[PDB]
Design a protein around this ligand. Structure first.
Ligand SMILES: O=C(c1csc(-c2ccsc2)n1)N1CCc2ccccc21
Ligand SMILES: O=C(c1csc(-c2ccsc2)n1)N1CCc2ccccc21
Lengths: 233, 238, 249, 237
């Protein structure tokens, strides 16, 4: 179809579980060669097995997005063995230090992969926001504000080169980190969601898949909220 | 049955489908497998829609619909229900000296009343099926000055607010409500100046709007509601 | 039978609004009343409106009791006839209002009709008073949000979105004429409805507000007073949120 | 009714980057409202100029050297103020710092945080406070809109963290202001720029200062986390 990513190398950070894993499989399903990262070797191996078990070509790697050395080395590894990643999905992650640290990691990784996208005159950077999950509202709303601003600016800097930069802002998603919130807090959160249910990780992955397609080529600087109608600021 | 982005077995209603973006949306939804009903305000335009659909192998019809009239809306909807079935995908693209910065209010207010009128009518069928997609298309940037920016930004502001609220009203029923906000989509040779406000350096294509709409209509966009997806190549006027 | 028009050497340093005539709609209670007194305190001649003659009289008494020159009038902002007549009345007897504060709203398909009705009333009233502001080449229109917090969460974000868009657009249409158009978006304000909540729910509500307290009506009035001053002359199209740090989207 | 405290008599205000333009205008406005004002610059010449301006306008205070990018500069300066003048309860951040898009915004917000944190002990102590952050005055749209986005988000979050203590945290987002940068634009570009501003004119530095003066008063006590745009109707996002 025209949703196809055949011939594209996608890099998905933090792909051993939940939303990251779901994004890796979705992009794989659309035909991309997928490289998923975790911070440990056990997690890199688990990614590799998941990809095999779902008929997706690619690899798992160890990547620490807080380290320039990790980013440089990893990127070079990918370039030699697989090719240049033109689809990059940032999902890997003191109110201030959290947001500030994250956005610096977004920038670090974003900058590094841009040489390859520039060279090809085509690209997709997609940034995944933090999931709503029980200091909590303050940090969430801030991390979302910083992401929206960041994404918009970067999109402006790189647009001339045919590179889109977008974000996806999850609401309350069904994941391992959310499955075991207390009932009281879960129920409260359901009560603020017009659809009356948690989102699925796959439902985030679908949005990401579309932003990566050629059909989303005029969409850039956007933050698509995926939250069942619940908007927390 | 069950596939990523198939609309097989869905009836989609696309208003203002005789040209440009509306036409592109009708063909995109048809391509994805929906049975498409496209409307225009004139009979000539209804006929042209029918031909386009036939010429592209899309099952459906062209109809005359005036979204400003409760009678037109009722009658048309009843016609569709008897002959084709219940539309569960509805796409609102019908919207009404040089332009000035005092035309903003009547235009926006009239459009949102029409959005509501139509939205309300099709909701009984979506409620009854416990599934639905309403997608509202914004106006493309209409003119080159402040007066052009005033009307655009306002029509967008009202659409964002409207869409969000309606989504909240109908969410419990598994009905998503979203918008698409086009930027500059495909005369006077301040062309270059205009392209210089757009990071991608080009006008958008009507097909590029249609793709976004097609996704919002799919099962994969089921958790997306109340959103206004901007499709403007990186150029943001508020 | 109902009289619908009711009137009434110490120089306070607060008196910045120099005889100017301010019109404050819905001024019989709460935030509207607080705005009328604040503008009066700053030296304006204040005309406050209600929809009934009893309310027009109560406004007049409040203004008298606080040493504020002006009047209470009957005004129905949903009616072109009421708006025209009232505004002509004001012109003949008191002068041309150059400060106008829209606080007369409407409350409880309900979601759309409320917002849509209010914005039409805003436009109706705003259009009418503009001839006088145009003629003077100076003006202040201020719209009070219903984008009230007690009005609650379900329709709040929408009423705010419509107000913010509206305010911004009108500001653009009238700016060349030295007329500012701005809004004030209250959060949770202390009024008689909000006082009589159970402790259990009161505490929950206060726990969503960083300042840990309800706002006072006077605190909204102060913001309005500033937007009306010459110092806020470069502020236009703005919606100032006044909610103690609680932001609902 | 007629008698209340929109006065700042008895308050110590700290205004960073106060040697010219908007900073200077803010320092004189707060002084005019009765505050004891401490204005900072990065050079000693600028600290002197601030002191003269304050003297010349009958405003009690001082000019100091402050580098908001340095923890040592911030600590020392604050301690100096505490010993000699008292505890600043009004703080106005107008001092900024110099593919440059991210580092600028990121550096500024780190400075905002550094300074904000330091002055909070004193505000906490008194259970009252005003922090006000001034945005940058107008590739050009990218940097402006970003710096505004990061400020709006920052301001809002900090306001949440400190609200229980009766401390408001707000921002002012200037549009096109009449200052040294704008005095040297070509007529062609000037006219184009005015044409995008509904009021049809540049803002004055004093017009920013008035907004700041209000946010510092007791009447703005329920306003927190807000970014007040002061741009004559011209909104770039
Ligand atoms: O009815 C309006 C409306 C009428 S005019 C208008 C507008 C907005 C910006 S300029 C004019 N908005 N709105 C705007 C937002 C909204 C939400 C829910 C129901 C109604 C509405
Ligand atoms: O630290 C940043 C930050 C660093 S760069 C940046 C940014 C935002 C828009 S473009 C760059 N934002 N932010 C942005 C918003 C925010 C809120 C609370 C704590 C931190 C932050």
């Amino acid at each position: 179809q025209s949703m196809s990513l055949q011939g594209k190398v996608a890099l998905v950070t933090g792909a051993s579980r939940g939303i990251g894993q779901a994004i890796a499989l979705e992009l794989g399903r659309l035909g991309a060669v997928v490289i998923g990262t975790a911070t440990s070797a056990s997690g890199a191996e688990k990614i590799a097995e998941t990809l095999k078990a779902n008929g997706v070509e690619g690899a798992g790697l160890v990547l620490d997005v807080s380290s320039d050395e990790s980013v440089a080395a990893t990127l070079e590894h990918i370039q030699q063995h697989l090719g240049q990643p033109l689809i990059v999905v940032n999902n890997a992650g003191e109110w201030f230090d959290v947001v500030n640290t994250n956005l610096n990691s977004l920038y670090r990784l974003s900058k590094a992969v841009l040489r390859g996208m520039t060279k090809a005159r085509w690209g997709r950077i997609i940034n995944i926001g933090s999931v709503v999950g029980a200091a909590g509202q303050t940090n969430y709303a801030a991390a979302k504000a910083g992401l929206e601003g960041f994404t918009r600016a970067l999109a402006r800097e790189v647009g001339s080169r045919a590179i889109t930069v977008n974000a996806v802002a999850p609401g309350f998603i069904d994941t391992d980190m959310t499955r075991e919130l207390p009932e009281a807090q879960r129920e409260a959160l359901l009560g603020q969601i017009p659809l009356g249910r948690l989102g699925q990780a796959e439902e985030i992955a679908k949005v990401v898949g579309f932003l990566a397609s050629d059909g989303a080529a005029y969409v850039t600087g956007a933050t698509v909220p995926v939250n069942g109608g619940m908007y927390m600021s």
